[PDB]
Design a protein around this ligand. Sequence first.
Ligand SMILES: O=[N+]([O-])c1ccc2nn[nH]c2c1
Length: 300
Amino acid sequence: QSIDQLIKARGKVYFGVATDQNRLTTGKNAAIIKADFGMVWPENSMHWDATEPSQGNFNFAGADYLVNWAQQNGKLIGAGCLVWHNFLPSWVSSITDKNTLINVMKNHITTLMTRYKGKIRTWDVVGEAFNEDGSLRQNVFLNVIGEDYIPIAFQTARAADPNAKLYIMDYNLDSASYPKTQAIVNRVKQWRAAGVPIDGIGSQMHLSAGQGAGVLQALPLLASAGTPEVSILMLDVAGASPTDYVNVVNACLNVQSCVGITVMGVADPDSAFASSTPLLFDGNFNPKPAYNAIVQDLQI
Ligand SMILES: O=[N+]([O-])c1ccc2nn[nH]c2c1
C-alpha cells in the first residue's frame, strides 16, 4: 500500500521523500516514489554550492532533472533551502558589505524561484536560523546584514513566486520544553504580525531512537505560531522503530495545520546515517517493519 495515498485519505496533502537524479536512475527508487510518495524534494541539487558555486554562475541541471521528473510523474515538489549557513560557497561567506550581501541573497532567491515559478509547492526560504538557546544563529547573513535578513528573504521570495508556500525550517524542535522550540514560535508570531510572509514552519526531524513520542507535544507547539501550515521534513529515525515512526505520523495527523511529512530518502544504504538503518526501506528495497506499521496506522 501507498503511504501517500493513505495519508491523503486522512486529509493531509502528502507523504514525500528527498531524492535526486542518480537515485531516480538507480535501484528501485523511481518505482517506489511513483507508487508510494506524493512529493519530492532535492536531496542536494538545490544547495547553494550546487546551484551558484561562483557568483552568478548558476548550475541547474540537477534541480531541472528533479523538477522535470516530478512534473512527468505527477508529484508535488518542495525545494530549499535558499538561505542557511550550510552548503555555502566561500564567495558568499567572505562578503562583508551589507548592501552587497543583501542583493546576493536576493538574486539567489529570485533566480532559483523564478526558474521554477509556479511548479514548486513549498520553498524552504530560511533554514537553521536559531541557536540552541533560542537566540539567532550568527551566520554570515546575521553578521553582515543583521536580523532584518530574515524578513528581507521572505519578502523577496513572495515577490518571486507568490504561488509558493514559504517556510522557515529548523532542527531540534522535537521537544516542547526545549528553548529553541518556543523561541522559533515566538519570533515567527512577531515576524508575521509585522507583515513578513512566513506561510510555514518546517521541523527537520533527524531523530534518535525513542524521540518520536515527544513530537506529539512539540508539533502542536510549533503550530501555535499561527502559520497557515507546518510540516515534518528530513525525517529519519535511528533504528527505524515502528513506534517512533507511527508516533511522528500521528503527530502530523493530530495537528490540523500539518500538511505532510517528508522522509530523508528511500532506502537505508542511501542515508547519510546508513549504519543506523533509519529509513523505511532496506538495502534490498523491501518495506521495513516501520513502513508496514505506518500503513496499519493509516488504514473515533
Ligand atoms: O524534507 N526533506 O527531506 C528536505 C530535504 C532537503 C531540503 N532542503 N530544503 N528543505 C528540505 C527538505
